[PDB]
């Protein structure tokens, strides 16, 4: 059977986004998601379906600016709402779905890390750590001079303190370059492209 | 040359997933990945290629529910298996590829953060921190009353303890809103759509 | 209007990447991003547009190997460059855009977490924590034997120290399975596919 023009938008609707493995595009059917605009007269289905939700004006609708961004599904689906990943576990700690959701379509979220604790390098005999404690074992502390009206002294920020040339295993906090400015998984950077006209 | 119907599935095969920049779809060729079902008689190539791997039944195959989820490649490829990002570094710490992999196709993984350490706000002269230590320098500790049969006292969970109105630089632990319920990178939320019929 | 062959590449250009919800592909128009190669004579537009940027040779151009990887947009766009997510906040801490960027197209980044601090389980009266401190309140410390030429003792790595069967709420550091080998958000694993020929 021979294919007609109405099947084009059916196959890839204007408004759709995919990835692109190079730096330039071969045709004006697609545009980069780099925050430009399109002309509404040039791209009437983009103007009608997307409008100004990514900025611009009705005459020159905005394109998404996805440079630097990861993508997640909008909303919160069955893998996140399952009761078995919500509520608190047997130790009273929230399960890993709690507080995790996509936004509305087009919403941008900043980097974040879950709250979490570490066991400290000092402590005492009583079961009275401000934020919890281990069982008693081979751990240092003092028997002298304890009182309970002090400050909590902060840990450092996870970067190394001593120079690499003077460290060994026990003077090194972390896996190499794990701590930095950004929370993000292993990833490849690609361009995102959006379909704007037939 | 004129295009025939067999080239449709060639160009975008049923089973393919991309992103969508709005809240509704213009045709029934695509469906949202929101965990619905399709009819197998309506969508025979979806029924044959995908079947019940995302749930549903043979008569009404399930759609993926990608709401709230990021996407990674299934498996573990050259960027993760390269020996230069595996094994231990010169300080005995596992390199950043270790333990990092995609799952099988359709597998869902929960949020996670790598193990890591911080330098503590207290310590002693001996090279005997339970979890390691720095070199000796301008760091507080006590010379009195040490013993080694105590508990380790936990750090807090990274949220601020004192109110913003009473903090300054040194009373503030973290970058603003960095700590929260979720580990995730900077991202935009979009819909995912799957091709279900011609 | 009847559709001709030149509209194929227009609709989905060779070089485009999307996702795939199964384990095999129905036609040779697309290939998995599993690090293979294609033949340049079989796939001349792939050879001309992509060349050897993902490896291989001019005669047999390489395919991306996206197995295990997430995707982010290349570059750094308006959501990351906005002055209101850069610079330092009122406490002198860098806002959450600082240091966050996509790479060049095809660049791979390793997992990372932002630097951050926790409040320690010990401290003293003076406003002199090496890495900061809270206000004075109900916090343990010693009044005896302080000096300032010690080491900083490290925290542990966030994994639990005591066995689950012997823990309760206050002996448990973290949300269940939050700490592991990998920093990554909630996600689904899928195949990535790239368009290589008409
Ligand atoms: Zn930490």
SS3 C179: strand
Q: How far is CA C83 from the centre of its chain?
A: 23
Question: B127 CB near a chain A CB, below 8 Å?
Answer: yes
Please choose, from the candidates A159, A158, A176, the residue with its C-alpha nearest in 3D space to the C-alpha of residue B87: A176
Q: How far apart are CA C52 and CA C56, in angstroms?
A: 6
What's the Cα-to-Cα distance from C130 to each of A156, B120, B135, C114, rounded to whole Å? Answer: 8, 9, 14, 20
- Closest by CA to A134, choosing from B119, C171, C71, B78, is C171
Q: Among all chains, which residue has been given the structure tokens 């980069």?
A: A32
Contact C35, C191 (CB under 8 A): no
- What does the H/E/C string look like for chain A? CECECHHHHHHCCCCEEEEECCCCCCCCCEEECECCECCCCCCHHHHHHCCCCCCECCCCEECCECCCCEEEECCCCHHHHCHHHCCECCCCCECCCCCCCCCCCCCEECCEEECCCCECCCCCCCCCCECEECCCCCCCEECCCEECCCCCEECCCCCCCCCHHHCCHHHCCCCCCCEECCCECCEEEEEEEEECCC
Question: Most distant CA pair in chain A: distance in Å?
Answer: 90
Distances (CA, A) of C176 to A15, A98, B6: 40, 12, 50
A21 Cβ neighbours under 8 A, 6+ residues apart? A190, A191, C15, C16, C17, C50, C53, C54, C64, C105, C106, C194
Chain B residues with CB inside 8 Å of A12's CB? 12
Indicate yes or no: CB of B64 within 8 angstroms of CB of C147: no
Hey, what domains does chain C have and what are their CATH numbers? 1-67+190-198 (3.90.1340.10), 68-189 (4.10.1070.10)
Distance between CA atoms of C134 and B173, rounded to whole angstroms?
9
Residue C13: closest CA among B20, A30, A188: A30
Alpha helices in chain B (DSSP H): 6-11, 44-49, 78-81
CA dihedral C180, C184, C188, C189 (to 10 degrees): -80
Rounded CA gap, A75 and A64, in Å? 19
Q: How far is the CA of A158 from the centre of ligand 1 (A)?
A: 7
Ligand 1 centroid distance, CA of C2 (Å): 61
Closest CA to C139 of B118, A92, A122, A138: A122
Which experimental technique did the depositors report for determining this structure? X-ray
User: Which pair of structure tokens corresponds to residue A107?
Assistant: 């919403």
Q: Cα separation of B163 and B177, whole Å?
A: 14
d(CA B172, CA B160): 7
End-to-end CA distance of chain B: 21
Comparing CA positions, the residue from C55, C101, C49, C104 lying closest to residue C80 is C101
**Within an 8 Å CB–CB cutoff, is residue B118 touching chain C?**
yes
Q: What is the distance in A from the centroid of ligand 1 to the CA of A157?
A: 8
Q: List helix spans (H) across chain C.
A: 6-11, 44-49, 78-81
Bridge partners, residue A61, by sequence: A56
In terms of residues, how long is chain C? 198
Euclidean distance between CA atoms A65 and A191, whole angstroms = 10
Residue B19: closest CA among B61, B74, B76, B69 = B69
Alpha carbons B110 and B183: distance in angstroms, whole number: 10
Task: Using CA coordinates, name the residue in chain A closest to C18.
Answer: A18
- A107 interfacial to chain C (CB closer than 8 Å): no
Using an 8 Å CB-CB cutoff, list chain A residues near B19.
16-18, 71, 192
Query: Which neighbouring-strand residues pair with A189?
Result: C72
- Helix intervals (H) in C78-186: 78-81
Spell out the alpha helix ranges (H) of B39-193: 44-49, 78-81
CA dist B195 and B64 (Å) reads 12
A196, A41 contact by CB (below 8 A): no
Contact present, B191 and B36 (Cβ < 8 Å): no
Resolution (A): 1.5
Cα distance between residue C133 and residue C198, in whole Å: 63
B-to-C residue pairs, Cβ atoms closer than 8 angstroms: 392
| Residue the block writes with tokens 């979806």 | B46
Interfacial C residues in 137-166 facing A (CB < 8 Å): 137-145, 152-158, 161-162, 166
Cβ neighbour number for residue A69 with a 10 Å cutoff: 27
């Amino acid at each position: 059977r021979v294919v007609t023009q109405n099947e084009i938008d059916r196959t890839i609707p204007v408004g759709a986004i995919m990835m692109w493995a190079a730096d330039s595009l071969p045709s004006d059917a697609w545009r980069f998601c780099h925050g430009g605009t399109v002309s509404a007269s040039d791209c009437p289905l983009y103007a009608s379906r997307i409008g100004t939700r990514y900025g611009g004006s009705s005459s020159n609708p905005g394109l998404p600016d996805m440079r630097g961004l990861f993508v997640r599904g909008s909303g919160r689906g069955s893998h996140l709402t399952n009761p078995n990943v919500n509520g608190n576990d047997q130790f009273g700690k929230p399960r890993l779905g709690v507080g995790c959701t996509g936004g509305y379509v087009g919403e941008v979220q900043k980097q974040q890390m879950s709250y979490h604790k570490h066991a400290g390098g000092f402590g005492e005999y009583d079961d009275s750590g401000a934020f919890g404690n281990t069982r008693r074992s081979n751990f240092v502390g003092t028997r002298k001079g304890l009182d309970w009206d002090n400050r909590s002294y902060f840990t450092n920020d996870g970067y190394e303190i001593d120079p690499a040339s003077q460290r060994n295993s026990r003077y090194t906090l972390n896996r190499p370059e794990l701590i930095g400015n950004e929370t993000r998984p292993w990833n490849i950077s690609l361009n995102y492209i959006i379909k704007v006209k037939e």
